[PDB]
Design a protein around this ligand. Structure first.
Ligand SMILES: CC(=O)N[C@H]1[C@@H](Oc2ccccc2[N+](=O)O)O[C@H](CO)[C@H](O)[C@@H]1O[C@@H]1O[C@H](CO)[C@H](O)[C@H](O)[C@H]1O
Length: 272
């Protein structure tokens, strides 16, 4: 049992939560766990429908010649008794929220997409432990930050290989960076099967596939004991914009987070 006030894993608090949460899921890819079931693989290929993708097992073998192939799938949660995490979305409800110090007080701070901290630190914090990206939504990261690649197609895994070595992939469905500066040892890979678990069990099949925001939340339910959300949802005026500047069912995903908050499995900080 964790030593926090409450523990996300705890069963028999909410049967709605217990129906959905599966403690056996592994959120990160490793050489050990990389075999996909045929149904999961076919579903994952259908997300972006690449023509004639390379063999996935060959692609993953080549990937783990480059980035670490034996990460602990819960990032060494077994060595801590209360891991507290902040998941920071991109909403302009963070503007003038002054949430930075409270965000930075957490053990892990998880960010996503091209969201910057520089010049926004009083609102969004300066700490990042983990940052979710995909080739089409990447920005250079500070050297301490773990990069969590979320792969939506075979080419996303080939892009990690390329962008840290030969720099041969510069376009997917849009232009993508040919090179990144992230150290290979700092790269983590979101497991495809965990994407499908989010879609089937948490989203009950709503949307074409899950948004990055909700993938980040459910990932954090597994790796953390206590989760606080910042920068999710609209602002107080009903605007959806980013704090610095038809694929997903954002209303259904929103409602999952609202329900999670109502049963004290997360806390949501609404901002401004
Ligand atoms: C808006 C939308 O449907 N985006 C899809 C679409 O994207 C494009 C296809 C062809 C040309 C330009 C774009 N694009 O810049 O919008 O199809 C691709 C697959 O080919 C993706 O599914 C786009 O969806 C985005 O996918 C990323 C992950 O790659 C992430 O889930 C975004 O939230 C999602 O909008």
């Amino acid at each position: 049992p964790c030593t926090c006030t409450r523990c996300i894993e705890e069963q028999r608090v909410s049967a709605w939560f217990d129906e959905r949460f599966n403690r056996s899921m592994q959120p990160l890819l490793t050489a050990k766990n990389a075999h996909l079931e045929e149904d999961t693989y076919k579903w994952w290929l259908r997300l972006q429908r690449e023509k004639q993708p390379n063999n996935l097992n060959d692609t993953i073998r080549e990937l783990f010649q480059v980035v670490p192939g034996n990460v602990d799938p819960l990032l060494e949660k077994r060595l801590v008794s209360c891991r507290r995490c902040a998941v920071v979305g991109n909403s302009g409800n963070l503007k003038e929220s002054y949430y930075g110090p409270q965000i930075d007080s957490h053990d892990f701070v998880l960010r996503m997409n091209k969201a910057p901290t520089e010049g926004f630190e009083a609102d969004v914090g300066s700490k990042t432990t983990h940052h979710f990206v995909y080739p089409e939504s990447f920005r250079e990261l500070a050297q301490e930050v773990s990069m969590i690649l979320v792969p939506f197609k075979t080419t996303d895994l080939e892009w990690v290989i390329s962008a840290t070595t030969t720099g041969r992939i510069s376009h997917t469905y849009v232009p993508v960076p040919a090179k990144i500066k992230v150290k290979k040892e700092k790269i983590l890979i979101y497991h495809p099967a965990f994407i499908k678990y989010v879609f089937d069990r948490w989203l009950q099949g709503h949307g074409r596939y899950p948004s990055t925001g909700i993938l980040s939340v459910i990932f954090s339910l597994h790796i953390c004991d206590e989760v606080d959300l910042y920068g999710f949802g609209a602002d107080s005026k009903g605007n959806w914009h980013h704090y610095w500047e038809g694929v997903h069912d954002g209303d259904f995903e929103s409602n999952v987070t609202t329900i999670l908050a109502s049963i004290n499995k997360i806390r949501i900080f609404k901002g401004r």
